[PDB]
């Protein structure tokens, strides 16, 4: 059995090849205490990871070692991988080959450090670093499609046709669920609610995924919200205080379609999906429009597939079907795809074995992986 | 100005709604012209159903209820005591209509009092034409009686008639329609051929007033 670990910017998804869902899903977080430890005994630690850090968060400064799909803190990332293998999966990593994941257009140093740590500290026998949106296409059961993947740190489009990616047509956008969470912290302040500690950011992250949705026509939903009570919903803080919220439920996700809400110059996710299809060869575009695959947690909003279908139908020529493909399990589809790829009987020649790393060093990964 | 006064009175009572549409709708439905505001303030002590309750819906789409009180009579009083509205204008409408007819030539004064036509939406207040007629008839007969008492002989008087009519709400448009139907109408217009010669200066000269040159 191989391991599959999808190193998300916000969640680790981890498990074994050939299983149909991840065994471990937990925050991609390390927390450290920020207050006086007055009491001796009673089960304390200098640091906490994942669900322990999420449960104790009132007393901790939380941080994510991933920013925009790049590992920015390697000592904390080792603590997350150690927690993944030894606490959450309960395996010796020296006994199992591991499939890892990253975003396209990442720094080469990210992939070099990620292969080095895995051989040189976890003693893994063989490992691989797949592109996240190539794995999401395996889970969808397809050879052709353009995959919009949006997680916690990155949004990316990669078009694939008959098993070939078009690497020049790949689009990347460093705007996803962390930027939507921080923009919800911004606009909750105008309703009178202040969220500022990194623990309060996790409350706003939970408000975002229980209350926010994508408006099919934003300017009509703004008019509807300005003239109705029916738009508004309430949320219970951990304090038992109840907040109430209205147009902020669809203004937050609309940042994906209008990145200028957070002061970005970027085109929206509909425009970058169309720009990626229009960078492809003219013969493949028909099959990419019919196979717009959506994946990752920032695609889980109510109404996002319908706004995405409406907007790409407004960009494309009217004579061919735009189909947005939005599986109900699409929040895990990168990990599902890694479980398929690591289970395929043709893949076992493609692993980087430690025997290759022992002669080539960490630069082996750039010639074994896409 | 009577809407801004209604709005200002709702706002002085801190009523749940004082939006401009709600002050407008309280003029059209609740307001009327009384004989005298100190007697009518006293009637709002003597009789309790003089205060109305007005149901209004907010800009953000929920119900409210407004108590409407002395603005029912005090707001239409703006025409009959403009010192309520303004520092800059002081003469009440019945005295102002007297000043129009007494500055006008003597042979047309019976005709000008015999036919005082009301026009425009803000003349539609309940009892407005009756307050104007009685207060102007008072001004007119006090002026005639000063002359009868000097001369020792009774006059024929003058009938003051204030006229409210079925087209009063839009009388300017209905008149414009009736006058533009005339066979001669196209001869009173500026034609674009006049404008091609003289430009916008063709329309500059006052029609209603006496011009020099
Ligand atoms: N149901 C949801 N609705 C909206 N946002 C969600 C939802 N579920 C998760 N998210 C957001 O998506 C991100 C987690 O999705 P995931 O695909 O696991 O991202 P990643 O792999 O990069 O860590 C977080 O930023 C979270 O705020
Ligand atoms: Mg991710």
From Swiss-Prot, chain A:
Q: GO: which molecular function terms? A: actin monomer binding; ATP binding; calcium ion binding; calcium-dependent protein binding; cytoskeletal motor activator activity; hydrolase activity; identical protein binding; magnesium ion binding
Methionine (R)-sulfoxide: residues carrying this PTM = 39, 42
Q: What are the recorded Gene Ontology BP terms?
A: actin filament bundle assembly; actin filament polymerization; mesenchyme migration; positive regulation of gene expression; skeletal muscle fiber development; skeletal muscle thin filament assembly
Enzyme nomenclature, EC number: 3.6.4.-
- Purpose: Actins are highly conserved proteins that are involved in various types of cell motility and are ubiquitously expressed in all eukaryotic cells.
Query: What ranges does the record give for the region Interaction with alpha-actinin, renumbered to this chain?
Result: 105-118, 353-365
Record key words, sorted: Acetylation, ADP-ribosylation, ATP-binding, Cytoplasm, Cytoskeleton, Hydrolase, Methylation, Muscle protein, Nucleotide-binding, Oxidation
The regions listed as transmembrane in this protein's record are: none
What SMART domains does the annotation carry? ACTIN
- Gene name as annotated: ACTA1
Where in the cell does this protein reside? Cytoplasm, Cytoskeleton
- This one is known as Actin, alpha skeletal muscle
| Organism listed in the record | Oryctolagus cuniculus (Rabbit)
Oligomeric and partner information: Polymerization of globular actin (G-actin) leads to a structural filament (F-actin) in the form of a two-stranded helix. Each actin can bind to 4 others. Interacts with alpha-actinin. Identified in a complex composed of ACTA1, COBL, GSN and TMSB4X. Interacts with TTID. Interacts (via its C-terminus) with USP25.
Family affiliation: Belongs to the actin family.
Curated annotation (Swiss-Prot), chain B:
GO MF entries: actin filament binding; ATP binding
Q: Kindly state the subunit structure of this protein.
A: Component of the Arp2/3 complex composed of arp2, act2, arc1/p41-ARC, arc2/p34-ARC, arc3/p21-ARC, arc4/p20-ARC and arc5/p16-ARC.
Protein location: Cytoplasm, Cytoskeleton, Actin patch
Report keywords, A-Z: Actin-binding, ATP-binding, Cytoplasm, Cytoskeleton, Nucleotide-binding
In Swiss-Prot or TrEMBL terms, this protein is called Actin-related protein 3
Biological function: Functions as ATP-binding component of the Arp2/3 complex which is involved in regulation of actin polymerization and together with an activating nucleation-promoting factor (NPF) mediates the formation of branched actin networks. Seems to contact the pointed end of the daughter actin filament. May be involved in cytokinesis.
Listed under GO cellular component are: actin cortical patch; Arp2/3 protein complex; cell cortex of cell tip; cell division site; cytoplasm; cytosol
Q: Which family does it belong to?
A: Belongs to the actin family. ARP3 subfamily.
Per the record, the GO terms for biological process are: actin cortical patch organization; actin filament branching; actin filament polymerization; Arp2/3 complex-mediated actin nucleation; endocytosis
KW Nucleotide-binding (keyword) present:
yes
